[PDB]
Short mmCIF file of N, CA and C in Angstrom, two decimals:
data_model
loop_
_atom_site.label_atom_id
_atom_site.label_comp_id
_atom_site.label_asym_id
_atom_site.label_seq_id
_atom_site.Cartn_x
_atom_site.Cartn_y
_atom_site.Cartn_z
N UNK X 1 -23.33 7.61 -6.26
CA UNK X 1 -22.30 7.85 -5.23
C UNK X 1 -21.66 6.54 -4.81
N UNK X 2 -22.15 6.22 -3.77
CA UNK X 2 -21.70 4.65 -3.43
C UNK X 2 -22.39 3.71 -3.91
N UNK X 3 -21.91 3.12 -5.42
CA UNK X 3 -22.52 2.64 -5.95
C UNK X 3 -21.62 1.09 -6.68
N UNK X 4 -22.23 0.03 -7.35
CA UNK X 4 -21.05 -0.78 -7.86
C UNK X 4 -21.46 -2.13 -7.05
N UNK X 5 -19.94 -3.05 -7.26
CA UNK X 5 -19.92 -4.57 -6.37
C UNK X 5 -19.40 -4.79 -5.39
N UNK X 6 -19.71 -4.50 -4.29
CA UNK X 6 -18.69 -4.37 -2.99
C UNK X 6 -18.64 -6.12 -2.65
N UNK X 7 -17.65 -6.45 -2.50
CA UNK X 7 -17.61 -7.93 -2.02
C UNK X 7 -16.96 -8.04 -0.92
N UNK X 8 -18.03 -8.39 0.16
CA UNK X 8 -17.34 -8.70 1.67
C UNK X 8 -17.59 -10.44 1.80
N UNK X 9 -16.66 -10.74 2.07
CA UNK X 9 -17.05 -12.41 2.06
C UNK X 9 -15.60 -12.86 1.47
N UNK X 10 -14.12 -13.25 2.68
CA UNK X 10 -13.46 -14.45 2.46
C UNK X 10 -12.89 -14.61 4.18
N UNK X 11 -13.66 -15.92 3.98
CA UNK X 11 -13.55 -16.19 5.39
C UNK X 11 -12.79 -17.94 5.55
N UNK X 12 -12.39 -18.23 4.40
CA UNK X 12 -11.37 -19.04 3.84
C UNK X 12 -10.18 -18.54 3.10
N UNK X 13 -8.94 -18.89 3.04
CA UNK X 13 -7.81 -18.01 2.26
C UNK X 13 -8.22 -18.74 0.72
N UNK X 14 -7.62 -17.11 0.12
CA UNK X 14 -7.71 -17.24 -1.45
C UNK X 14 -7.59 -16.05 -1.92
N UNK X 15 -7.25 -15.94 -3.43
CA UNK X 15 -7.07 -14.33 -3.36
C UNK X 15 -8.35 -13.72 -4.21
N UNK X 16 -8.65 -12.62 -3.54
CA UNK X 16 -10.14 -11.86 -4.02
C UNK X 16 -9.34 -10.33 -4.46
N UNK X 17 -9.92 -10.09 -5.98
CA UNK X 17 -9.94 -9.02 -6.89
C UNK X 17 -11.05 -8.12 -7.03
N UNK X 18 -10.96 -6.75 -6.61
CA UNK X 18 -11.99 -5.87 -7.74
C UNK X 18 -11.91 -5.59 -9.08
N UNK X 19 -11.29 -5.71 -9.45
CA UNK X 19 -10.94 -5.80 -11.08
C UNK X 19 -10.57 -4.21 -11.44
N UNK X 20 -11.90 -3.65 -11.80
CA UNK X 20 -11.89 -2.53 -12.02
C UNK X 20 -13.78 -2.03 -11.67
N UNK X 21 -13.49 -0.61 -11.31
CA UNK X 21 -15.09 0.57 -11.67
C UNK X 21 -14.94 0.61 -10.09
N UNK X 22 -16.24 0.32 -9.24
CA UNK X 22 -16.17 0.36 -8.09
C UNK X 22 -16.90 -0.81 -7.53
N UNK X 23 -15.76 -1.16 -6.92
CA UNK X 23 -15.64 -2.82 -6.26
C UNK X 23 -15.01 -2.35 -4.83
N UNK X 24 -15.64 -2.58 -3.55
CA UNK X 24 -14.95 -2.98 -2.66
C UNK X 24 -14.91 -3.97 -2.00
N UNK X 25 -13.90 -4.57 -2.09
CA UNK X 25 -13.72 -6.13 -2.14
C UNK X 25 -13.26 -6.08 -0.05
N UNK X 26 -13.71 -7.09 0.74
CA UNK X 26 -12.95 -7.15 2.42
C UNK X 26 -13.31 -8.37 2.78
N UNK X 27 -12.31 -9.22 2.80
CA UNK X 27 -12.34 -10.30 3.02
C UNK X 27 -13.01 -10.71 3.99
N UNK X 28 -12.42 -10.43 5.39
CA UNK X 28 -12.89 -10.29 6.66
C UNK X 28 -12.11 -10.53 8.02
N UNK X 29 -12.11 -12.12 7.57
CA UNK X 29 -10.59 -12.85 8.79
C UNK X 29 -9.70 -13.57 7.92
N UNK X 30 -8.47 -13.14 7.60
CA UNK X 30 -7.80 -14.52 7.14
C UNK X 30 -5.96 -14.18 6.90
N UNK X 31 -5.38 -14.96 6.43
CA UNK X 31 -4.43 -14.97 6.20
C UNK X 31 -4.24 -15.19 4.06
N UNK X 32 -5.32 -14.45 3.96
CA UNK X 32 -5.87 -14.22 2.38
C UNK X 32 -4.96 -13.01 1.90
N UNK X 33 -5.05 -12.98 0.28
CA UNK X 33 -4.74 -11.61 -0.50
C UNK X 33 -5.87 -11.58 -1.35
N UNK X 34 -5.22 -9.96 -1.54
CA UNK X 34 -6.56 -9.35 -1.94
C UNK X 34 -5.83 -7.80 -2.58
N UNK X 35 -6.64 -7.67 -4.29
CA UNK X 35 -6.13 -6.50 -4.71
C UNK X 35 -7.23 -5.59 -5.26
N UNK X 36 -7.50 -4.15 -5.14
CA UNK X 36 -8.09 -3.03 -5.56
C UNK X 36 -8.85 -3.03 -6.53
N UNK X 37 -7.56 -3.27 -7.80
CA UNK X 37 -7.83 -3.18 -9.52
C UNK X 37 -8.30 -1.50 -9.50
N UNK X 38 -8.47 -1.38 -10.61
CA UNK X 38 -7.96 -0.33 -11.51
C UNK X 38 -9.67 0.39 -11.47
N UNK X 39 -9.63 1.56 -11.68
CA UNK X 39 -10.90 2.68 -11.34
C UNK X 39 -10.14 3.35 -10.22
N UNK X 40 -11.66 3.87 -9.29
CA UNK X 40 -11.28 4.78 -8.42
C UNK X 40 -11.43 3.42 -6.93
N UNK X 41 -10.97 2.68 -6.02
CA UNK X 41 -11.54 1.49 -5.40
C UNK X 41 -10.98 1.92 -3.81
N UNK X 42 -11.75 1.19 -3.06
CA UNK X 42 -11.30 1.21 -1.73
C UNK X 42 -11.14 -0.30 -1.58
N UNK X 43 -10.65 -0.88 -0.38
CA UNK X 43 -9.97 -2.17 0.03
C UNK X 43 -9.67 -1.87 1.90
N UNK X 44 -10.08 -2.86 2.16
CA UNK X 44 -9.83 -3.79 3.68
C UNK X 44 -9.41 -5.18 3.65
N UNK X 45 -8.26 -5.65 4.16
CA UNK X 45 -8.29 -7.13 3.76
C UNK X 45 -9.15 -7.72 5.21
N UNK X 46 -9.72 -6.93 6.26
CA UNK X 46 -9.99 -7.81 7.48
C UNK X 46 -9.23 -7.76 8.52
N UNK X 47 -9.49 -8.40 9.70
CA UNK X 47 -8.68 -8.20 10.85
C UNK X 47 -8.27 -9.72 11.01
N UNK X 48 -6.45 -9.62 10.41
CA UNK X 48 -5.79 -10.73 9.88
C UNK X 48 -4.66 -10.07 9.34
N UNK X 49 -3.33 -10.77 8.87
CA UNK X 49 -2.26 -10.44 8.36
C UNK X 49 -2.70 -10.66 7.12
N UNK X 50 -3.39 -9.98 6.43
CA UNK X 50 -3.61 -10.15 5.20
C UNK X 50 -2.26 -9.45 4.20
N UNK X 51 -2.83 -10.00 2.83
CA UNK X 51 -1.56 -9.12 1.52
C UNK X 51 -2.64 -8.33 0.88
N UNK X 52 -2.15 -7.22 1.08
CA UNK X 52 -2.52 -6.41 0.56
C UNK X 52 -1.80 -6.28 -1.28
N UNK X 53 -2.19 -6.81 -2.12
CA UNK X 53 -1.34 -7.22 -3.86
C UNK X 53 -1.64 -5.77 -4.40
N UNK X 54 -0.94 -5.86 -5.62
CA UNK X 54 -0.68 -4.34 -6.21
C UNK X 54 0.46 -4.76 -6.68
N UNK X 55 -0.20 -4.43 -8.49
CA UNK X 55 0.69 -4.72 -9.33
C UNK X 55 0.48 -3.81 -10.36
N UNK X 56 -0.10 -2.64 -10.30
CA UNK X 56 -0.19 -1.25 -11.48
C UNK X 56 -0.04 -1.91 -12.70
N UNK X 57 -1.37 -2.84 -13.17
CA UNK X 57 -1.30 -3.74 -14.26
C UNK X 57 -2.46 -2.60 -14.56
N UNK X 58 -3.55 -2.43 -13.23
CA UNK X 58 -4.87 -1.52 -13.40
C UNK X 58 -4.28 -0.52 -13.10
N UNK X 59 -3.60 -0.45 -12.02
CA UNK X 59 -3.62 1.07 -11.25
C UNK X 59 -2.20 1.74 -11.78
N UNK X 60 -2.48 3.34 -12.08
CA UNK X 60 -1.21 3.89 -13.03
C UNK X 60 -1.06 5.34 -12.10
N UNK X 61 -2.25 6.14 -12.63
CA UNK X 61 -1.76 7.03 -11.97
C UNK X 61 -3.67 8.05 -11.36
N UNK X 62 -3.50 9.51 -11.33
CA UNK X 62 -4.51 10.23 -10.98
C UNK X 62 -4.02 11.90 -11.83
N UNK X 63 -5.20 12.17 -12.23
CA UNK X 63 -5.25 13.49 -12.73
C UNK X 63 -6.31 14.51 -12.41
N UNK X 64 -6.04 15.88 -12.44
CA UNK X 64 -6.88 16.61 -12.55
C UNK X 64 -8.47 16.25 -12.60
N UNK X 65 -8.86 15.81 -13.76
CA UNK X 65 -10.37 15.43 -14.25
C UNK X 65 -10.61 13.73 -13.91
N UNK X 66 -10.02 13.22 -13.33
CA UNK X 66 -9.72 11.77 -13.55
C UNK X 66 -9.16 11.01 -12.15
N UNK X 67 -9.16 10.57 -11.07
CA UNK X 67 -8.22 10.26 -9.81
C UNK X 67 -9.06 8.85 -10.01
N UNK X 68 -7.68 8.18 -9.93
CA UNK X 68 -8.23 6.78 -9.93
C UNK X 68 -7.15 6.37 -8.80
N UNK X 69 -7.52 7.07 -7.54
CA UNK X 69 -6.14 6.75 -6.34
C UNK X 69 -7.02 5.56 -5.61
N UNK X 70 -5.84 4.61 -5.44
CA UNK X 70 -6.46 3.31 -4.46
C UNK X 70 -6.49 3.75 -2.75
N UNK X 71 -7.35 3.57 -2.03
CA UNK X 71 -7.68 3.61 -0.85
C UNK X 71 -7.56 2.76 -0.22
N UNK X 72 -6.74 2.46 0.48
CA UNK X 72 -6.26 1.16 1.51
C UNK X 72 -6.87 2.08 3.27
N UNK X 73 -7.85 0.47 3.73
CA UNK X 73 -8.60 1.15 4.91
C UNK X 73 -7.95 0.31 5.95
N UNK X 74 -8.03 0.40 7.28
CA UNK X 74 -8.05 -0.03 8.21
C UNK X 74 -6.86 -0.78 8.50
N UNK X 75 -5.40 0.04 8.23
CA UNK X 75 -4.18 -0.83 8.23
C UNK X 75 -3.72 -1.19 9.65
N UNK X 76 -3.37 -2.45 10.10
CA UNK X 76 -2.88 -3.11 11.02
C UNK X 76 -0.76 -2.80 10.94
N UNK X 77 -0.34 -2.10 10.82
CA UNK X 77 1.67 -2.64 10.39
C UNK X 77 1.30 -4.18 11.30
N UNK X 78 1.06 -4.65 12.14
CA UNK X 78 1.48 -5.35 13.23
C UNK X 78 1.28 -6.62 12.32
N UNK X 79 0.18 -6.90 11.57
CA UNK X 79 -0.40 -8.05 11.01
C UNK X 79 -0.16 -7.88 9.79
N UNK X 80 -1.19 -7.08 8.76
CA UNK X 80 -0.89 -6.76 7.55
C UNK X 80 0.28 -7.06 6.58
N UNK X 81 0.42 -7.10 5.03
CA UNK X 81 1.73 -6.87 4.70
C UNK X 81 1.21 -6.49 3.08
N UNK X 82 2.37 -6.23 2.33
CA UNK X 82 2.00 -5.29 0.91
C UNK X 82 2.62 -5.80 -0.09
N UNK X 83 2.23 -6.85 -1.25
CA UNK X 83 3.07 -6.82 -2.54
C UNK X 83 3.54 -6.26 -3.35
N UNK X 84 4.79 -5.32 -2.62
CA UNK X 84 5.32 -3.86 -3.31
C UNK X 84 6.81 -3.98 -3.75
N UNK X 85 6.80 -5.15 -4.64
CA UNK X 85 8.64 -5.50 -5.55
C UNK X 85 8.39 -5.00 -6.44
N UNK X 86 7.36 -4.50 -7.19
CA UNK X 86 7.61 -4.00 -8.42
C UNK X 86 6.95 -2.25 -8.91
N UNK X 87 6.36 -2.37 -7.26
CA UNK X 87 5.65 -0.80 -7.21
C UNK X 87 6.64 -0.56 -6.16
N UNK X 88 7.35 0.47 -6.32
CA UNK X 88 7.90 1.32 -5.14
C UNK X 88 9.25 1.06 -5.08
N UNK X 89 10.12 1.66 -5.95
CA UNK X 89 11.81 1.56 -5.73
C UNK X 89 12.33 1.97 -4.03
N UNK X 90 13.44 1.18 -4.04
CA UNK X 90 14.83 1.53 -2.94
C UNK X 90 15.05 2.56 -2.64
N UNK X 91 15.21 3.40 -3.73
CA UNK X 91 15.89 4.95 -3.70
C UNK X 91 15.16 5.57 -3.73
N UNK X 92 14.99 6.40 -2.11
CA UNK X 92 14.11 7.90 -2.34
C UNK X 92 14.77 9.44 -2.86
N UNK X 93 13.89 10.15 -2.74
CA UNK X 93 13.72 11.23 -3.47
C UNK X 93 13.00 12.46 -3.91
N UNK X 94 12.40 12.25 -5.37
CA UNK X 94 11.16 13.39 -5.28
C UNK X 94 10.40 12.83 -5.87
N UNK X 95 10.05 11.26 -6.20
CA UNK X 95 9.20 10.79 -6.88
C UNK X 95 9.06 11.14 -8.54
N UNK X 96 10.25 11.60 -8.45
CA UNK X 96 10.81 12.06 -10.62
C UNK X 96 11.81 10.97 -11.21
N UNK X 97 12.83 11.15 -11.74
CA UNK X 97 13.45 10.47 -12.30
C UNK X 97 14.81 9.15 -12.01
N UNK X 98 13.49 8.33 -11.18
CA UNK X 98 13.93 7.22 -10.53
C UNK X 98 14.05 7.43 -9.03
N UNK X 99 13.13 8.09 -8.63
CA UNK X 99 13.23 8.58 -7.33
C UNK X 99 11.64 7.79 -6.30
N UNK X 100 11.86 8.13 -5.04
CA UNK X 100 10.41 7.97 -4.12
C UNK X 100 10.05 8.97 -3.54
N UNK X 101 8.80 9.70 -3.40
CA UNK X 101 8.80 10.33 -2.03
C UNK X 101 7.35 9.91 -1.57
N UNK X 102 7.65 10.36 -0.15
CA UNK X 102 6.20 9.73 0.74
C UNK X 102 5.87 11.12 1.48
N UNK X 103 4.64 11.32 2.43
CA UNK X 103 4.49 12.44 3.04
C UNK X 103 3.35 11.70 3.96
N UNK X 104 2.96 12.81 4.90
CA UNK X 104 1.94 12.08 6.15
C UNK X 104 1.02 13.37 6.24
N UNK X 105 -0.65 12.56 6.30
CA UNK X 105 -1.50 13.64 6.60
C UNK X 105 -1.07 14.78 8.08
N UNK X 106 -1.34 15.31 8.40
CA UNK X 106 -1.68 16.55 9.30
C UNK X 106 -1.69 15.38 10.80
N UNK X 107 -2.41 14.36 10.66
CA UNK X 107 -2.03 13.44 12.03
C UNK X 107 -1.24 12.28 12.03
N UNK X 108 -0.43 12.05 10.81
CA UNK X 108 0.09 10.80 10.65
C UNK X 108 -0.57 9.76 10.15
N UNK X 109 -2.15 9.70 10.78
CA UNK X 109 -2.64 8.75 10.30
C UNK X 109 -3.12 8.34 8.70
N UNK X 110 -3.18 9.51 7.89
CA UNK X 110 -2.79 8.74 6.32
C UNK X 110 -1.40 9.07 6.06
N UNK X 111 -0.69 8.13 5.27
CA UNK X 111 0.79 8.42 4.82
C UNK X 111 0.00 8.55 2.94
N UNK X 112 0.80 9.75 2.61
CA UNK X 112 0.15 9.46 0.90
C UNK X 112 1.57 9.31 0.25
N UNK X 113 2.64 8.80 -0.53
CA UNK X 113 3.36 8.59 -1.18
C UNK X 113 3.11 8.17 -3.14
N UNK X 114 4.00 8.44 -3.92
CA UNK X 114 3.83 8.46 -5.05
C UNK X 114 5.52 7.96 -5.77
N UNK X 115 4.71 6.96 -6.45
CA UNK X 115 5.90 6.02 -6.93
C UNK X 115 6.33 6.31 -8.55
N UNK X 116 6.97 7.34 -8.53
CA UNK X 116 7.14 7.94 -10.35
C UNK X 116 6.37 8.05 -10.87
N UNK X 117 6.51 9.88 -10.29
CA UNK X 117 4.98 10.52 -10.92
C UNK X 117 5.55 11.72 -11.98
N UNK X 118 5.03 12.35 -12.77
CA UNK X 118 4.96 13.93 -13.73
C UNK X 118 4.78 14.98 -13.21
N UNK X 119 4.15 15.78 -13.97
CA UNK X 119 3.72 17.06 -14.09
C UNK X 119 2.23 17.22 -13.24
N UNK X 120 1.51 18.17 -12.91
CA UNK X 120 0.10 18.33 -12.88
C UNK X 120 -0.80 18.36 -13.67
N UNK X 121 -0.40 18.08 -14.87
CA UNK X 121 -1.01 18.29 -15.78
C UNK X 121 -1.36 17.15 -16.70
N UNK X 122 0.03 16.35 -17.10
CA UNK X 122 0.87 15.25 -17.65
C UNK X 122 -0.18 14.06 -16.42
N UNK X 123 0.31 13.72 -15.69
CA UNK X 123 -0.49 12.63 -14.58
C UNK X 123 0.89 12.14 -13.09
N UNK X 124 0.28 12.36 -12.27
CA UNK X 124 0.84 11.89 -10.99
C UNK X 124 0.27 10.91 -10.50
N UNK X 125 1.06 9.79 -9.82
CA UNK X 125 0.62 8.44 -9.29
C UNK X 125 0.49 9.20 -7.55
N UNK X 126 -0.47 8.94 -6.85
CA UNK X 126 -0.59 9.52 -5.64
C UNK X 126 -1.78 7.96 -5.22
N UNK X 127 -1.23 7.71 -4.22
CA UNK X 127 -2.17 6.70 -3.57
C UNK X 127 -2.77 7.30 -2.33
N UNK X 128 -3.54 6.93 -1.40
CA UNK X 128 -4.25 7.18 0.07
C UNK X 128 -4.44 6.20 0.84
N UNK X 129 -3.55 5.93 2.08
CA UNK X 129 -3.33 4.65 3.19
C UNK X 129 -4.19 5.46 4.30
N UNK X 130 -5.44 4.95 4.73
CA UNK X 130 -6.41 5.25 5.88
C UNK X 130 -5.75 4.41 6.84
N UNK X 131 -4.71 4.92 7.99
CA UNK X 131 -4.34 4.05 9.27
C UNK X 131 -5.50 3.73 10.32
N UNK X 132 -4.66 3.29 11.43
CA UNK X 132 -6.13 2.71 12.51
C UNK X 132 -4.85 2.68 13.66
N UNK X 133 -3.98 1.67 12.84
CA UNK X 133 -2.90 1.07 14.49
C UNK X 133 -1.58 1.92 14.16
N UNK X 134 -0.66 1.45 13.48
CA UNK X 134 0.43 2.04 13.15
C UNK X 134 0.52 1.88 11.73
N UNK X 135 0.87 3.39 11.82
CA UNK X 135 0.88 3.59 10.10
C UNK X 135 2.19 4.04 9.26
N UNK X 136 2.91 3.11 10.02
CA UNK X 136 4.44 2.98 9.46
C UNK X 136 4.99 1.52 8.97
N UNK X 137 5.37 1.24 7.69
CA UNK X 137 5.67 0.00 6.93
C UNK X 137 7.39 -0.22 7.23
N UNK X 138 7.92 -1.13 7.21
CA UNK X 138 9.26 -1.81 7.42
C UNK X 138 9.33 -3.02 6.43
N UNK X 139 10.26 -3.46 6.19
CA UNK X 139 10.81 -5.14 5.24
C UNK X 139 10.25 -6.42 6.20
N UNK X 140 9.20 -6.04 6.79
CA UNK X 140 8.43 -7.25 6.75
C UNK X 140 6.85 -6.57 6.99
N UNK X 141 6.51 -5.78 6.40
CA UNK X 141 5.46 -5.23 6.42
C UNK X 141 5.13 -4.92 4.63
N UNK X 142 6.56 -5.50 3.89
CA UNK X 142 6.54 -5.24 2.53
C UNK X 142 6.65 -6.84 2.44
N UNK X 143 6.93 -7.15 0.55
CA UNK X 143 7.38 -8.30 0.54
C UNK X 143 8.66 -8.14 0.15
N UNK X 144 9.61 -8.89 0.33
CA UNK X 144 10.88 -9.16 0.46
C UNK X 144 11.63 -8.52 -0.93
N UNK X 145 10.89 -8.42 -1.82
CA UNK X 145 11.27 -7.84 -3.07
C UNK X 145 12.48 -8.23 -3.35
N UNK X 146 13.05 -9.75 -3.54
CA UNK X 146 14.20 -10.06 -3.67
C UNK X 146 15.07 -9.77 -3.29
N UNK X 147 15.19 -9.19 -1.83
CA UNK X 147 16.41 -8.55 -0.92
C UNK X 147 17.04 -9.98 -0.59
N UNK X 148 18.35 -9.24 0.08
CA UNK X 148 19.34 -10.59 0.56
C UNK X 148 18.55 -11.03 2.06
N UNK X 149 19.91 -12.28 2.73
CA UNK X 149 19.55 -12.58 3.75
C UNK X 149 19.69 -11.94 5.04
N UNK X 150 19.41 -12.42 6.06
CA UNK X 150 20.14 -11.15 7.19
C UNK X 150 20.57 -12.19 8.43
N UNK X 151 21.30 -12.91 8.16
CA UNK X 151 22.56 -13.47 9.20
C UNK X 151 23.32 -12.23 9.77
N UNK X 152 23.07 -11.15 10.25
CA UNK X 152 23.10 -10.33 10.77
C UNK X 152 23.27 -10.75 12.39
N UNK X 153 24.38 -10.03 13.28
CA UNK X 153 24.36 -9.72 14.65
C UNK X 153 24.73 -8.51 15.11
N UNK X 154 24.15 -7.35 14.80
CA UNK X 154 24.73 -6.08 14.98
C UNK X 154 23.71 -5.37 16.02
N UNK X 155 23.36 -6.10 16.88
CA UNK X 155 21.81 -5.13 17.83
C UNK X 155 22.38 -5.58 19.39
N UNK X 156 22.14 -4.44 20.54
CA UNK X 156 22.52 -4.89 21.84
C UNK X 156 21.78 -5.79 22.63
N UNK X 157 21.19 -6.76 22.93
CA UNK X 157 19.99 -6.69 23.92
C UNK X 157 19.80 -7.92 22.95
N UNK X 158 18.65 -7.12 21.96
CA UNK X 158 17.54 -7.90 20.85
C UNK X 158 18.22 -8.15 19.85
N UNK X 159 17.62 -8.84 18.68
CA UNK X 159 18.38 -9.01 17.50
C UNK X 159 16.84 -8.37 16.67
N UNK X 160 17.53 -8.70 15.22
CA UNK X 160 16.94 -7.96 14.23
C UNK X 160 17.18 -7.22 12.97
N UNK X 161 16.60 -7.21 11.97
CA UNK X 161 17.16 -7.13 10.38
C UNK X 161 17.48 -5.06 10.38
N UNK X 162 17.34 -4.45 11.30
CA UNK X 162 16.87 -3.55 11.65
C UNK X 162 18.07 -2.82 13.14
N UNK X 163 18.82 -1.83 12.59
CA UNK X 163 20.18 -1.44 13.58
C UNK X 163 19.39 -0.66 14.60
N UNK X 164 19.13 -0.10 15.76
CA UNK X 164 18.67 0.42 16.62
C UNK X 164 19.01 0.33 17.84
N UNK X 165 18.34 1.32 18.81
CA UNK X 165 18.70 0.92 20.62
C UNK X 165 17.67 1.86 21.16
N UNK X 166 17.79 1.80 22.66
CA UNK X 166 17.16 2.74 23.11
C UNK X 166 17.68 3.26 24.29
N UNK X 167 18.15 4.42 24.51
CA UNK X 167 18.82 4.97 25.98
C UNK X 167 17.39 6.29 26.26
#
């Protein structure tokens, strides 16, 4: 059952890997990254703005007989952030043919989304985000994924990369 190399221990920055099988890798405190790898894996980076990395070099998708979905625990939005330029397009959708879609457990607190997935049969990419604080991501809760700049002044009050108000 719970079985494998769990590695808790970075309490200096650097980046810590599970590779693959079952590894749960949690840093602890830092301003560190830290990635899953490929099997079925869970992940904490710590209570810290950690990077959460992810690069579907390991991780592809989940099937029927087979779920190799990554488990991200104990997300901070406030601190946290996600190396997601090359997992997770611009344009949503239905998660088919160049598309995104995302969805939220029954309390909000897991969001599960799937980044160009198939059939049920064929294989679907489906991940699982375990929240704690706020379990909603924004463009600085991602990495910048080569977006432009934002010399932007379009907000009343506050400023921000981000159009809004509140009455």
């Amino acid at each position: 059952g719970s079985d494998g190399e769990p590695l808790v221990g970075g309490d200096t920055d650097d980046q810590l890997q599970g590779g693959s099988g079952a590894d749960r890798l949690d840093g602890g405190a830092g301003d560190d990254i830290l990635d899953g790898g490929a099997g079925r894996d869970r992940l904490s980076g710590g209570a810290g703005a950690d990077t959460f990395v992810f690069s579907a070099r390991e991780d592809s998708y989940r099937t029927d007989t087979a779920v190799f979905n990554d488990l991200i625990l104990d997300f901070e939005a406030s601190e946290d952030r996600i190396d997601l330029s090359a997992l997770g397009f611009s344009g949503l959708g239905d998660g088919y043919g160049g598309t995104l879609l995302l969805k939220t457990n029954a309390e909000g607190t897991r969001t599960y989304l799937k980044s160009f997935e198939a059939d049920a049969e064929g294989r679907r990419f489906e991940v699982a985000l375990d929240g704690d604080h706020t379990g909603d991501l924004s463009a600085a809760n991602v990495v910048f994924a080569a977006t432009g700049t934002t010399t932007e002044l379009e907000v009343l009050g506050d400023s921000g990369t981000q159009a809004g108000a509140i009455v």
